[PDB]
Structures are given as structure tokens and as C-alpha cells.
Scaffold this active site. Structure first.
Site, short mmCIF file in Angstrom:
data_model
loop_
_atom_site.label_atom_id
_atom_site.label_comp_id
_atom_site.label_asym_id
_atom_site.label_seq_id
_atom_site.Cartn_x
_atom_site.Cartn_y
_atom_site.Cartn_z
N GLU A 131 0.79 -1.24 0.00
CA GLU A 131 0.00 0.00 0.00
C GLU A 131 0.83 1.30 0.00
OE1 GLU A 131 -3.67 -0.24 2.34
OE2 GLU A 131 -4.06 -2.28 1.65
C1 LIG Z 1 -6.37 -5.31 2.54
C2 LIG Z 1 -6.56 -4.26 3.60
O1 LIG Z 1 -7.67 -3.80 3.83
N1 LIG Z 1 -5.43 -3.92 4.20
C3 LIG Z 1 -5.33 -3.04 5.20
N2 LIG Z 1 -4.20 -2.70 5.85
N3 LIG Z 1 -4.33 -1.87 6.79
C4 LIG Z 1 -5.58 -1.48 6.97
S1 LIG Z 1 -6.09 -0.35 8.14
N4 LIG Z 1 -5.69 1.14 7.60
O2 LIG Z 1 -7.57 -0.46 8.32
O3 LIG Z 1 -5.40 -0.62 9.45
S2 LIG Z 1 -6.63 -2.23 5.87
#
Ligand SMILES: CC(=O)Nc1nnc(S(N)(=O)=O)s1
Length: 283
Positions: A131
Site C-alpha cells: 500500500e
Molecule cells: C487489505 C486491507 O484492507 N489492508 C489493510 N491494511 N491496513 C488497513 S487499516 N488502515 O484499516 O489498518 S486495511
């Protein structure tokens, strides 16, 4: 078709052990969230693991036991790399290829003596939930992992977790240039969610036409509750039904993915949200 759930980050606060969700029969694939630090290894599973090796790396005996219980019950358990926030990058393809070996020896069936956070338990593969908008290395990593998997004694799986905008700025390259079993597409926090400008059709074109694996399975990734994401949660069971009806009519449809288990299991709609979805898939 299958229900996949992310587990480990305790979105709801009330997260139960991994085996508890495996024993529920509402989900089929579990994505352990997350190996949030690499190449220098670091894991985080919120309250579900806190012991470490002397060098700080998480050592998780209960998760290890639960991975084995889950697998006995026919479930697949993948280790998810990355996550929103968290501290990771590859400098280049060579570094990422080295890292394939590290994952194999640390988490898989590799025999290279190194610290194993899950002791003798062996994951069923890896999810790339990248991400940070940096795509370096992941295609190379995936490709190298496939070669190593031949040394193992079971089938292994690789998945990616793009957000719905296409192409994805973090795993787009991975998805275009490596052999991937599952795409858990996040139809939330974005314009292309189900009640937004839903772009399943673009992902279908990707599956039939771009994906090196023509048999890639696409998953409708959804928040598990109103509090699991800023936007994109669906509580209209009619819309869910019709959405599923629209997208289940191809061989590329794999099922639903949820962020996350703590949310989808505790959110009731007086039946758990994950159960409602499992049941809509069955028909
Ligand atoms: C696949 C997915 O949703 N991954 C996520 N990683 N971190 C998240 S968070 N900002 O809600 O803690 S969501």
C-alpha cells in the site's frame, strides 16, 4: 467460491484467536496481517502475539498452533505482506529475489536454518497487500517463490490486495507480470466501491486478458462493518444479493474478501455479517 478474511490487526478491538475464526465455518481463507516490515523481518498481530526471539522478531506459538488447526479443518492460511502504514520496500529485483528465499526458509518448507515465528507450522503461501505506491520487486519475488514452492509437499498460493482503481499503483506490476492465484480487490475507501462507480468489469477484463494466470480468481473485497473502513460498507442485503448475482456469472469470480475477521464476525445484521455473506455465496 470462498470467503477470505484478513485477521491479525484487530480492527474491531474484540479480535479472537485465529483458530476461533477457523472453527466458525463462515470463512475459508485466512490472511495473516501482517509481515509489516521487510526485508529486515518484522511482524505485527496486535494483541495476538507479543513474545519475541532475543533479536526482537515476533515468536507466536499460539498462532502457530492455530495455523495447524485451521489447516486440519481444510482452511488456507496465507501470510499477508505490507499493510497500510508499516515499513517496507525493495531497492531492486535482485533484493526481492533474495527475499523469496528468506520467506521460504522462514515461513515455508525451506530448510535454511533461521528463526521461525511460527515454529514448525507452514503457511499456505503469501498475500501482497502493498500500500505504499512502490511496485519494485514484487513480480520478481512472486516468480522466484513459484520456483521454490516445487520443493514443498503441498500446493502454495500467492494473492494480491489491490484497491479497486485500475491499475493499482502498488501491485499493478505484480498482477500484470506474475502468476497470481487470487486478487482480493478492495472495493472500499475508493470511488469504485459497490455503491460508487463499481468497476468489477475492468477487473474482469484484467483477469481474461492481462493476468499471466488466466485462471486468476477475483474477489469482491469489502469492509466487515460500518467501522472497518471510512467508506464502502454495504448493509443493504438486496444490493449484496444483486451484486453477487452480477459478478458470480463468470469463471473468474472467486468469492468475497473481508477487512477484517474481528469486524465481520462481530458485526450483526441478528446474524454475523460473515455468515450472511457465506450464505449469499452458497446460492
Ligand atoms: C487489505 C486491507 O484492507 N489492508 C489493510 N491494511 N491496513 C488497513 S487499516 N488502515 O484499516 O489498518 S486495511
Amino acid at each position: 467460491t470462498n470467503i477470505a478474511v484478513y485477521w491479525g490487526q484487530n480492527s474491531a478491538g474484540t479480535q479472537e484467536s485465529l483458530a476461533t475464526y477457523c472453527e466458525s465455518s463462515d470463512a475459508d481463507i485466512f490472511l495473516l496481517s501482517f509481515l509489516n516490515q521487510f526485508p529486515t523481518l518484522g511482524l505485527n498481530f496486535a494483541n495476538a502475539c507479543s513474545d519475541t526471539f532475543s533479536d526482537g522478531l515476533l515468536h507466536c506459538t499460539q498462532i502457530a498452533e492455530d495455523i495447524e488447526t485451521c489447516q486440519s479443518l481444510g482452511k488456507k492460511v496465507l501470510l499477508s505482506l505490507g499493510g497500510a502504514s508499516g515499513s517496507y520496500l525493495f531497492s531492486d529485483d535482485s533484493q526481492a529475489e533474495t527475499f523469496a528465499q528468506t520467506l521460504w526458509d522462514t515461513f515455508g518448507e525451506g530448510t535454511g536454518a533461521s528463526e521461525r515465528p511460527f515454529d514448525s507450522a507452514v503457511v499456505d503461501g503469501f498475500d501482497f497487500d502493498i500500500e505504499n505506491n512502490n511496485e519494485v520487486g514484487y513480480s520478481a519475488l512472486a516468480t522466484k517463490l513459484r520456483t521454490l514452492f516445487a520443493e514443498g509437499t503441498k500446493q502454495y498460493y500467492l494473492s494480491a490486495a489491490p484497491q479497486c482503481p485500475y491499475p493499482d499503483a502498488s501491485v499493478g506490476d505484480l498482477l500484470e507480470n506474475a502468476d497470481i492465484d487470487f486478487a482480493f480487490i478492495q472495493f472500499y475507501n475508493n470511488y469504485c466501491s459497490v455503491s460508487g462507480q463499481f468497476n468489477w468489469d475492468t477487473w474482469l477484463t484484467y483477469a481474461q486478458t492481462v493476468s499471466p494466470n488466466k485462471n486468476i480468481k477475483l474477489f469482491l473485497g469489502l469492509p466487515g462493518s460500518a467501522s472497518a473502513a471510512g467508506s464502502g460498507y454495504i448493509s443493504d442485503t438486496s444490493l449484496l444479493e444483486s451484486t453477487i448475482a452480477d459478478i458470480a456469472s463468470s469463471s473468474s469470480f472467486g468469492g468475497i474478501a473481508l477487512w477484517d475477521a474481528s469486524q465481520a464476525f462481530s458485526n450483526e445484521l441478528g446474524e454475523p455479517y460473515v455468515e450472511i455473506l457465506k450464505n449469499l455465496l452458497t446460492s
